[PDB]
Structure 1
Amino acid sequence: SESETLNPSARIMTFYPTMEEFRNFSRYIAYIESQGAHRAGLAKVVPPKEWKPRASYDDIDDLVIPAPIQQLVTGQSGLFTQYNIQKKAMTVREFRKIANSDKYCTPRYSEFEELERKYWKNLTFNPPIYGADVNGTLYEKHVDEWNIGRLRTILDLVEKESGITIEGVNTPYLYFGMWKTSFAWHTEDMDLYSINYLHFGEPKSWYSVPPEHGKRLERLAKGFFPGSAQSCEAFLRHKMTLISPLMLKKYGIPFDKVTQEAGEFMITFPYGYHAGFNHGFNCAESTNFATRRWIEYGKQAVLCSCRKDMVKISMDVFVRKFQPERYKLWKAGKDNTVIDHTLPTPEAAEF
């Protein structure tokens, strides 16, 4: 009731923490949730200006991108499917040269709405290369605030208990973008949170649908791609499906849009569908994390049913540790708990 009164429009919120607020990562997430941020599914956090995670990005031209992917997009009328074509390894220097070449570079424009229109007009032409899923971090070893290599959230329980690492999920990924490279509509694996920091370059634009409206987006997508939906219980997790804002408007799906600049963080929340594109040559770092509120999403995440090497995290350790009274009921398949997408994580109490 009090949570439904905070950010009731479920618009994307933007925060400007001071250094003292910034220092404690998990505490700040709880705070923005206490302000209703999660209701949007996506939030922006602008870090204090005296903060930098790396002195210089002049020394990484030799960094290898082992598996660049060329993004072939097919479709019309605002509905598309993206096919990946893996290309040969290349260095950042090589990647940047291609990105900034006349062939792949960002078109000229005035307002963002103009670039956005060009993206949706030309997305099936001249398929770009995305230097995605590069294992690594660009943080200096001694950065202790919002360090994507070690956020110290309860997601650490996975590795801690089982030794299991899942690349990009409890380890960091780098993404080197160029004009018109895309990320398709999806929620995170196991419906986890994610953090995304744009180290440098041109912006990355995002779309998001409130978790409270996630099911509507799913119903729409199933009607649009009945073949894919029949074959898999969670086809959007393939991350191949692109849907334009006009199409969302046309079918009454609530969504917001936000543009991320170099030096800014984006947080995505459990069950927040999102998608977007890069404006030009840029570099982003990301990984997943959890709070106590995520556990229930974890137990209920509807998972891809047709592919091996799909991400599945055993929820057992979390339920034992944080929901001991529900453990036996849950193991017996009788845990009928219903998720309230508006409630902030328990850690937010102090706020």
Structure 2
Amino acid sequence: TLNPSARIMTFYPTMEEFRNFSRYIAYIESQGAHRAGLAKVVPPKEWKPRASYDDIDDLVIPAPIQQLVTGQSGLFTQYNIQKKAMTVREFRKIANSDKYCTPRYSEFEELERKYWKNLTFNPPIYGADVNGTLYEKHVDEWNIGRLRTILDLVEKESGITIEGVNTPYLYFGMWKTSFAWHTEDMDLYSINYLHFGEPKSWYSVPPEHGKRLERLAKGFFPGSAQSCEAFLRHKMTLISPLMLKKYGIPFDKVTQEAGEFMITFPYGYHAGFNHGFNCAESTNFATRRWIEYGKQAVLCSCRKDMVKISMDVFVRKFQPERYKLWKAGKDNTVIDHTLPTPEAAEFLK
């Protein structure tokens, strides 16, 4: 089938193709993009979500996070220490200080080695999970604030909003800040735009090999595994690419740059780190292909306020012939990670 390498793909849509979000996602899936779990989409040169970013210095980061990393030989656990609120100006001041700034380097392979060699030292601050958007109110193409996908059935039918899932999150980062391995809540899709700043590097494991990654993680962190069915959802586990390589876990890497979009797919494990001071925005979204992932997503069974979406409305509206079967817990549909979402039908003929 398509993209049998399950390698990370990059797309350059024209302004025409760009306009319909859900439609372009259907397209890239018809090209096998999802098989890698992660994909890059470079927006048209004439596209910009905001005019200028010189007016956010006063924007407040209510819960900055200091990332303490503990571990050795490729396996680490990240602990969060919440610091007092601060502004984007204060944050940047710190991000650029000779204390937390980016080390000198030539090729990316070098910055990478330095990241994996010093991530346990000099714990950085991460202005993550910040409620808000940097999109201009009139931007109608790929506006994270309103992608208009079926995930809207959640708020529209129940009124329930889940910060970060069906509302945007801003992430202000600095050198060495990172994000642990994980898939989205309810195994949804994810859209990430890097408004500005230094690059953000990503690691991705193909959804078709996700179970292998979990198996490995469970063997390394048996304690966390025995305490939770999906401890990777805590987002505290870091695993180096060398360790994955050494245990035969298929994975790919890619560096996202300011102005580019990254898309993660259902059950696509990903992790990465920021090269330096930057700002990114993200939220989740869905397609009809997601519904099945949602019904089968293995959720965190030890924390409260953990994201759990009712799959009822989706199964009832898009899988009516399986609703009673599903409701009776008799629906044993097996998921094929290679198949594109049905909306991509028009692109396969």
TM bucket, shorter chain: over 0.9
How far, CA to CA, are the matches of 1:329 and 1:53 in structure 2?
44
Instruction: Report the counterpart of residue 281 of structure 1 in structure 2.
Output: 277
Shift in Å, 1:152: 0.2
Out of 334, 337, 342, the position equivalent to 1:338 is: 334
Q: CA deviation at 1:8?
A: 0.1
SS at the partner of 2:141?
A: coil
- CA deviations over 1:299-348 (Å, ceiling 9, x no partner): 00000000001000000000000000000000000000000000000000
* Aligned mate of 2:137, from 135, 141, 150: 141
How far, CA to CA, are the matches of 1:76 and 1:198 in structure 2?
A: 30
After superposition, the CA RMSD in angstroms is 0.2
Distance in structure 2 (CA, Å) of the matches to 1:322 and 1:83? 40
Shift of 1:45: 0.0
Match of 2:149 among 153, 170, 174: 153
What is the SS of the residue equivalent to 2:321? coil
Partner of 1:302: 298
Task: Provide Cα deviations, 1:31-69, integer angstroms capped at 9, x if missing partner.
Answer: 000000000000000000000000000100000000000
TM-score of the superposed pair, with normalisation by structure 1: 0.99
What is the SS of the residue equivalent to 2:190? strand
Alignment of 1:1-351 (within 5 A): 5-351=1-347
Q: Partners of 1:7 and 1:64 in 2: how far apart?
A: 43
Deviations 1:181-230 (A, max 9, x none): 00000000000000000000000000000000000000000000000000
Aligned-pair identity in percent equals 100
Q: CA deviation at 1:166?
A: 0.2
> Aligned equivalents of 1:146 and 1:133: distance in 2?
20
For these two proteins, the number of residue pairs brought into alignment is 347
- 1:256-277 CA-partner distances (Å, limit 9, x unpaired): 0000000000000000000000
Superposed CA deviations along residues 1-48 of structure 1, whole A, max 9, x for unmatched, are xxxx10000000000000000000000000000000000000000000
Inter-partner Cα distance in structure 1 for 2:290 and 2:136: 29
Distance 1:299 1:208 in 2: 23
Does the residue aligned with 1:185 lie in a helix, a strand or coil? strand
1:131-163 deviation line (CA, Å, top 9, x unaligned): 000000000000000000000000000000000
Unaligned runs of 5+ in 2: none
* CA apart distance, 1:176: 0.0
Q: Please report how far the alpha carbon of residue 93 of structure 1 lies from its aligned counterpart in structure 2 after TM superposition.
A: 0.3
Q: Unaligned 5+ residue runs, structure 1?
A: none
Detail structure 1 runs of 4+ shifted over 2 Å in the superposition. Answer: none
CA distance in 2, matches of 1:243, 1:309: 26
